[model samples]
Target: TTSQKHRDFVAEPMGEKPVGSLAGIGEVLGKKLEERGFDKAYVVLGQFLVLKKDEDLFREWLKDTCGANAKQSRDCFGCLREWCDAFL
Candidate 1:
């Protein structure tokens, strides 16, 4: 039940994609991430890895860092998790 954006993001290597490229991460959330030094997709991925790919921890981090809501955090977590499954 993923969205097209989710499919698209997980379909390939992250490269230097902006944080906004993440599913559920729009301009506002992207700006929040950038403010906290998470301007790139890879940087966020690093956080995901640092959290040991724990969905709960990752989601909590997303909420604490960027004020992502439950669904937004979930979507972003899912996107990164699937990306790791495919590429990491």
Candidate 2:
């Protein structure tokens, strides 16, 4: 979300940047998760931290909160997993 461009979150994480450097879909991501009340983009970062990196739990909230689209969580779970690898 910082400088990855609305279109560049995956590579950033895949690029192995800090976990704080996260964005979901776009500013489009913030709309869904922010409304759900986490934060702008890193809403997801904290969400995963608290979930202990459980793909199921993160994916669960992400799926519905982002509006019935499993795609969000699909890539998200893996992205978050990759971030966790770097963090740990």
Candidate 3:
């Protein structure tokens, strides 16, 4: 599950910062993600919306996209899911 900080972070505009602010994406993975073109949290959010919030597909996409493991996927998903619930 995502922490309250994660939810609060995404509840507002991500602005221009590193993708690591996205909860599940730590510094290492965030660098990897930036290398792969997901430089910002909003870019990842676009993919999440593209998946129409489908859990399995989104999880698989996260794993395949940035090598996120199961727990990482869950954390990311929970972050995005809660963000959508609050703002989207």
Candidate 4:
């Protein structure tokens, strides 16, 4: 089974949602992202697309950007991947 956050993110449009809306991104990580100018979900999606949906690179970027650990980065990556599969 997937997480509720994962389901929610993939179920609808990503219209200007906060970065924290992504799975595995809590307020702390959200703040960290905002500190580095990634304040929106689409911005992160942009990076994901720019990386050509490369899982390792995206996970590494997430770790570097917000100190996300393995699981956290994986969760976020999976979320975005699913969103892209469903929407983009």
Candidate 5:
């Protein structure tokens, strides 16, 4: 289920969809992200790229921004990484 969700999410351009649409960012993290200016999945993707795909930095940033635990950050980062691999 989770893998399907991740694949579905990264299958196309993110556009203006809410951050919650990305796998691993459920309602809680989504709301927090919206409150913190990352209202869209693309915005978060930009941040991920800006960090040069550094897993440690990206995960740390995600954790700091949304109070995500290690596993949460890992899942989100992995999703983004795989998405980039497919599209970018």
Candidate 6:
């Protein structure tokens, strides 16, 4: 599973981490996000935070922004939510 990445990402502060370090943001989604200025994991994190950490809004944004499916969006939302809880 991709839980390892989520665990590692949530285990520590997101310092200069690539967007791909985020769960569900593999090469394809990563590249799409990167092309639009979300190359950094923190950038995406900021968006999540800015969205008030709302799952519906965050997942919607991520999907629309990078064409992520339900699982991808949910995984990423969970990852960011957990990371923020632990380290924000």
| Candidate 4: segments with Cα more than 4 A from true spot | none
Candidate 2, poorest ten consecutive residues by summed lDDT? 12-21
Q: Residue by residue across 3-27, what tens digits does model 5's lDDT show?
A: 6768887788666877887878989
Residue-level lDDT for 44 in candidate 2: 67
What's the residue-level lDDT of 68 in candidate 3?
A: 94
How well does model 6 score by local distance difference test? 0.93
- Please list the residue runs of candidate 3 whose C-alpha ends up more than 4 Å from where it truly belongs after superposition: none
How far is 47's C-alpha from truth in model 3 (Å)? 0.1
Between candidates 1 and 6, the one scoring higher on lDDT is 1
- Candidate 2 yields a Cα-based lDDT of 0.57
Candidate 5: which pairs clash? none
Better of 1 and 2 by lDDT: 1
Question: All candidates' lDDT scores?
Answer: 0.94, 0.57, 0.83, 0.94, 0.87, 0.93
Give me the displacement of residue 55 in model 6, in angstroms: 0.3
- Model 3 over residues 1-88: C-alpha lDDT tens digits? 4576586676686777567887788877788888999999888888999989999998999898889999888888888887788777
Per-residue CA lDDT of candidate 4, range 1-88, in tens? 5789989998998999999999999999999999999999999999999999999999999999999999889889999999999999
My TM-score estimates for the predictions, one after another, are 0.97, 0.60, 0.87, 0.97, 0.90, 0.96
Quote model 6's TM-score: 0.96
* Candidate 1 global Cα RMSD: 0.6
lDDT of 6 by residue, 1-88 (tens): 5589889989999899999999989999999999999999999999998999999999999999999999999899999999988877
As for candidate 3, its clashing pairs are none
